[PDB]
Design a protein around this ligand. Sequence first.
Ligand SMILES: Nc1nc2c(ncn2[C@@H]2O[C@H](COP(=O)(O)OP(=O)(O)OP(=O)(O)O)[C@@H](O)[C@H]2O)c(=O)[nH]1
Ligand SMILES: [Mg+2]
Lengths: 23, 171, 1160
Amino acid sequence: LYSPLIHTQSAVPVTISPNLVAT
Amino acid sequence: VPTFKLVLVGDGGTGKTTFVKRHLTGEFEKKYIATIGVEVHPLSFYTNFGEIKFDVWDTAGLEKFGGLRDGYYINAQCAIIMFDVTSRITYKNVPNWHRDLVRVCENIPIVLCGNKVDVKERKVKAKTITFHRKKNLQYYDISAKSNYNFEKPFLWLARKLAGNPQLEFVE
Amino acid sequence: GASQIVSALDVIYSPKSNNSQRQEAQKFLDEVKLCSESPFWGYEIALQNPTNSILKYFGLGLLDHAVKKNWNDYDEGKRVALRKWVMELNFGVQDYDTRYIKEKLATLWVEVAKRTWGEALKQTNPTEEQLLTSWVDMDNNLFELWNINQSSRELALIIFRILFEDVFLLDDLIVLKRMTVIQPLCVMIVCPIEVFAIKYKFSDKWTKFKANEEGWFSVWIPELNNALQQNNSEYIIRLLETLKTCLNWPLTEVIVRNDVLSSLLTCLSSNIPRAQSMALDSIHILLTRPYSNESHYQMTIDRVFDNMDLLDSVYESLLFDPTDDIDETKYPIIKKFVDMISCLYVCVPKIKETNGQIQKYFKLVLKTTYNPSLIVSGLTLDLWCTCLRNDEYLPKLEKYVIPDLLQFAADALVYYEQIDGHISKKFAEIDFQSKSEFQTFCSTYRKRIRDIIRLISCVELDLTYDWLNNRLNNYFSSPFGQQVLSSTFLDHKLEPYLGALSQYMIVECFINGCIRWKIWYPTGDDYDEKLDSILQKLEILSNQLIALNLREPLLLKKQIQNFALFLTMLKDNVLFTLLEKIITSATMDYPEINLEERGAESDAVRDLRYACGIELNRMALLMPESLKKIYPDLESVIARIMPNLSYHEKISFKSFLLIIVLKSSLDMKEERFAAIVDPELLAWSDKTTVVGLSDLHWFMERLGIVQIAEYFQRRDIDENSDLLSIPIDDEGKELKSELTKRWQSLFPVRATRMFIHYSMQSIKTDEEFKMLQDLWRPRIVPILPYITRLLYQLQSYHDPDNWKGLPTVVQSFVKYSTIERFWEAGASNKSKDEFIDEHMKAMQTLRDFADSVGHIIRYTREYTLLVLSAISSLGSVFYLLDESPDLLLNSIAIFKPGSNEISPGVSTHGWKHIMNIAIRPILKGCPKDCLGKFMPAFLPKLFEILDLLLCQKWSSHMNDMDMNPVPTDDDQMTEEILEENLLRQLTTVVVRIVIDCVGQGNANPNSAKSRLNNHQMEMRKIIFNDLNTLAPFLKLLNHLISFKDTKCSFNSILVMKCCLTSVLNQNNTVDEYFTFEVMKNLLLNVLCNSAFKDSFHEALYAFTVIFLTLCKEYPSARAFLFEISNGYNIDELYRNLRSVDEYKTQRALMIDFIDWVKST
Ligand SMILES: Nc1nc2c(ncn2[C@@H]2O[C@H](COP(=O)(O)OP(=O)(O)OP(=O)(O)O)[C@@H](O)[C@H]2O)c(=O)[nH]1
Ligand SMILES: [Mg+2]
């Protein structure tokens, strides 16, 4: 119901998988 | 007028008798009374393509209270396996019901019905339910207390038995 | 007599018989079943008259009951006679026997085998008597049954199916007791002796059991091949039914020797649907079964992959045209085939590609992905995701299918549910039970498609970028692109908007793929040059996309969303350009329409402006330092914009400026912070607002209720007149617009919440955290009383006793505003569509006016709770001042003067929101250096408030249910279900509060290894070592377990176990209250009640611990326990427990005491 707020720890909206480390 | 025999199988306290009584009289039943033996309740649905009647054999879900358990399935032309979403033991027992239900009647259409969906807390989540996919069954979430989809399994079963896939319940 | 049984069966099977007659016949049959001659009677019934199928089935059921229940009682001779009867009945199978008769006979044979076969194999060199007892001739008899006739052939196949299923697939209890003899016997009978001896080493006593030396596969497989040549569909189906269950367990040498996979593939190349389905299941079983020999698995995966042409032909044959009607005979076969194909990618790195097997396999997978059905198509999306993520398949996958897969995924990224006449809905109406399920599946499907696009763009950035550039140019040169570019407002559920939205989502996925590439590519010497080229390409793409001059607000919104992803990669290079574009796109005039009428197309512009503001805040958070260089220009531009900007966007822009001021290390932080914050927070300290906030009539006047009464009087509206039928007026629209503007300006809850939260987001180290906390201190501590007073008034608005002072013409208006219209799927026969239809209908009705007033009230309450939560995050400033706990708690909970009713008129949903938003974050927000001054002044009242609220709500619910048994209509059932669900959720929130305040103690009674956190451990010192806080805490715990909720009661008992270590600290006052209440609550309402099954077991362990402790140190407890039990021997019961060390035996002693109390 309320309005969303941006946090500096998750401001980037990219949905890249966190488990990725390298090729 | 077509007359199809329907066997209502499920574990104890699942809501089979309550569901049948809701379809018959239209009022929810509060108390829980074990269904002794089997009860045959004629059921009729008015559709666009005519009149269809059902003989719903409400069977006992408790072992010690069951009668001719598998014998209640002879010459059946229909089936509904009812499980409770609030108790995982019913869903775990669902495969046994399908196994001993297809032994007597083989190529009948069967519907898996999840009851008591009206409650917030449910021990059988939607993802956990996959038996319908494994055995090409139809899974309709229903609630006798809430009348959520209490008519949908009968409509699907009528569509498959009669033949018409555009058959709709007009009343 | 048999005639009585026949009559009873006729009565119980005829439809004309009434239920009572049926029950009498069933009772007679049951009493017949219990007769000691039931097995012989059943055998005679089955043998004498095979014509009557039902009577024969009843006799076989009697035999089944004899062999299943009374098996242990029978002696060796009786068991042998029963086995002989079963064998004789099985050998007597003819053509007239129905399928279920054969199944029952097979069940009898399998039961007798499971209870007899292999008994003598556990003894050395058993004699012939023991061998005959152990049914040594099973294999010989079963092979004899194989040759009696074709009906006996089917019977033997069913026997094998049931036996193998029970032994291996199912976890049957009888076989589990004797698995180590039954399973190797099955391996013996199905495998050749030479093959068996390689793996197993048993002696000739095992070889005695095996009759056919060559095994059983050497019989089934040639028979299956012969049936396939002769095209005998029924025989093929029966053989596949038997063969499907005997392939996971047996030795793989038998599978390889008989070429089972070739037979399965031959079955698949047939047009029989059932045979194809069973061949699919068999092939999947062969693929996924364990392999002791890796070479056999290699041959299996080689032969499967060498027949890709056959699989493609099978898939093409299975396909059908779904325009008229889907084919239920082979659509499940299509789903099964796609599921089986999707599991084959694991074997890909092991196939030695010689004839392009891998290329054909991937082409087939892509072809199956093109299936019109989303369920069928969505099965391979996981395969594509996994293949793209891994590197074992990437060189083998990029060479053939990457461009085609990318093209498909781009073409499949459409809104299926909003396309009229789409081919996917035909499959949707059969695979899904409701439109909501189809919509959420479409959302998941589009999410996975976007994942595919992102992974492809990461792996193949150059090709993906070239293709995307060409596709965008072609689309925006197309007539639909011209319509999108040359229009201001588009139908948001029509093709021109949806296509462009899909293009923008594709662009977003490409940018996310570049972001992923930033990490995926190895950090070699070539990384910098490739990264620079990618940045140049992205900048060119961003400049190209901006130059389109897009005007549709809900699409320019998506462009602004993608602006943040562009800024993440390109950093400063395009920071100013994107910032200016976002700023100038939030102030576009849109002269065509006016934004004050709350139109359908005005909401799009409002959403676009809100998104622009939130993206401005996000950009300021991401890159504050770079914005410092341009801050004066930004300040001047925003100040110029301010008069031509709405209050909501005004607050958003001020927060953006505040982020730049605080984070960017700009000079004179305090002056800029004051100049930004003080004008917005000045409304809180307004003298008229301050003095009037303590008067409810002033609150109503500010809300405008007096104006609503005047408007109603002007329209001649009355209380007896139904508001649901009165048409609305544009004057009412203007009035509500003015009222909501004045309301949002009067109580700047949003401004305070945004400023506080975004100033908190500016914290990087403790020192500037302290200075910011000191800076916020003068602006909060004179404002907290007014925020609490506003929450007070919002709570008092729901009290019916406060409405009698209002004019009579608006008594019903406030009541209508108070009630809410929340809806749940499963709580009513209505779906979401007609519920939203009811809401839409009220729009043109005066009832929507009261609904909007109630929405304003609830929104203000939500935002003031959020403000209070944010002030908790401010740190020590909110907890060190002495007045804060009482000031907040008295505001949230309104004790009525005479009656004890916690805030009368406030719904359970409102209490849920209050608890979740305020109480939990504040309780967990107390610093470790501040609990000692805020906790002992907050918890003692908080637990009392929680106990009173829960007790009142639960008592009201049960009282309303009891005194109103039959609902008037189904709407009453829906209301009761919603109330019960909300009360359950509120109880869950309360028990979560208790858990996070204390911390539970594990499910196992003897395990207490759960390490409490520092915050949890610190509270237990305050609560357990203070009588003022402890006593209310047990009241909440005592009530929580009593309440009819499995989850909290089980959790609360677990908490109590962690408390039982310290709550019984020998305190006199604590111990006495523990005696009369907890035993009374646990024994009578938890232990004696069957509604707490799982809670009964956990409470019993807790009760036993308290029973030993209290009776040891308090003789009065034994006397008290004697009274409530009304007998028994507490001293004997206590002595028996202490002498027993095992908890399992102690539990048995308590079950007797609890059961005895139940009887008394
Ligand atoms: N909330 C809720 N409760 C239900 C629903 N359906 C059934 N129940 C409850 O479950 C009880 C089941 O009672 P019956 O239907 O008589 O049970 P039964 O099928 O005879 O039981 P067995 O003979 O043991 O198989 C009802 O009386 C209700 O208390 C439902 O849709 N929602
Ligand atoms: Mg029943």
